[PDB]
Amino acid sequence: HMASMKKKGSVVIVGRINLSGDTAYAQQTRGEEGCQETSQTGRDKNQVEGEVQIVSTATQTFLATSINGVLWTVYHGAGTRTIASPKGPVTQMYTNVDKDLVGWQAPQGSRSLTPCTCGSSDLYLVTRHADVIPVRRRGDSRGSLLSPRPISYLKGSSGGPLLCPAGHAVGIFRAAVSTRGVAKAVAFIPVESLETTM
Ligand SMILES: COc1ccc2nc(O[C@@H]3C[C@H]4C(=O)N[C@]5(C(=O)NS(=O)(=O)C6(C)CC6)C[C@H]5/C=C\CCCCC[C@H](NC(=O)OC5(C(F)(F)F)CCC5)C(=O)N4C3)c(C(F)(F)F)nc2c1
Numbered sequence: 001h002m003a004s005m006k007k008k009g010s011v012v013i014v015g016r017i018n019l020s021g022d023t024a025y026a027q028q029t030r031g032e033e034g035c036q037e038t039s040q041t042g043r044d045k046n047q048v049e050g051e052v053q054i055v056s057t058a059t060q061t062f063l064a065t066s067i068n069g070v071l072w073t074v075y076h077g078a079g080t081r082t083i084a085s086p087k088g089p090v091t092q093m094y095t096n097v098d099k100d101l102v103g104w105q106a107p108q109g110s111r112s113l114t115p116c117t118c119g120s121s122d123l124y125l126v127t128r129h130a131d132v133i134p135v136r137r138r139g140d141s142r143g144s145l146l147s148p149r150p151i152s153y154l155k156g157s158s159g160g161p162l163l164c165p166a167g168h169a170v171g172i173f174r175a176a177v178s179t180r181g182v183a184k185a186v187a188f189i190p191v192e193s194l195e196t197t198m
């Protein structure tokens with residue numbers, strides 16, 4: 001009944017993939033208790049850094065990537081949810097269920113990737129475990145893993161970036177193409193699709 005209708009919490013930044021040095025590594029910036037409280041209030045006072053955030057809801061954890069001043073992720077992770085910020089919940093700037101794409105204004109302190117114009121097919125996928133996985137581009141929205149691995153290793157990495165050799169953003173990881181549990185290929189949202197949305 002109406003008086004008891006609940007509101008879904010905000011997406012919460014709980015960590016980041018550190019790409020600022022010679023070694024990629026995951027950092028946690030918020031534990032589970034703080035994540036749950038921050039999801040309910042939508043108020044996150046933590047200082048944000050970097051290009052790839054680790055984000056969570058009460059039910060899911062995945063990634064988000066800043067490109068040209070927008071923090072992007074997948075709709076199948078975030079739905080229509082707000083994201084927590086120092087000033088309270090921030091409403092999505094972009095929502096496109098047909099692309100499996102959402103975006104919010106990039107958090108103050110984040111760094112943005114630049115959309116790739118190289119037209120290169122030698123790509124690199126960054127996972128929530130800070131693995132940098134070579135991927136050969138095979139179409140507008142598909143790439144093959146040079147070294148297949150179980151889907152367990154890719155779970156939770158939707159929203160992460162595919163990068164060109166020069167470190168530009170080429171796309172957003174969306175889904176794993178699996179054969180008997182082994183990911184041989186990935187589906188991604190091309191950065192051009194993000195650029196049209198903007
Ligand atoms: C109403 O709006 C909606 C509602 C629901 C939707 N559910 C969608 O797909 C779902 C979720 C997505 C996924 O698991 N993503 C990744 C991830 O990590 N998620 S996550 O972070 O853990 C988490 C779930 C927390 C957020 C990186 C993957 C890593 C491992 C895979 C695990 C096994 C799953 C294999 C599957 N494989 C596949 O579908 O391959 C095919 C492809 F999609 F490529 F065509 C080939 C034929 C289908 C796959 O990958 N997913 C199934 C899509 C999408 F993504 F499909 F667009 N849109 C939606 C739009």
Ligand SMILES: [Zn+2]
Nearest residue numbers: 116118164168
């Ligand atoms: Zn490039």
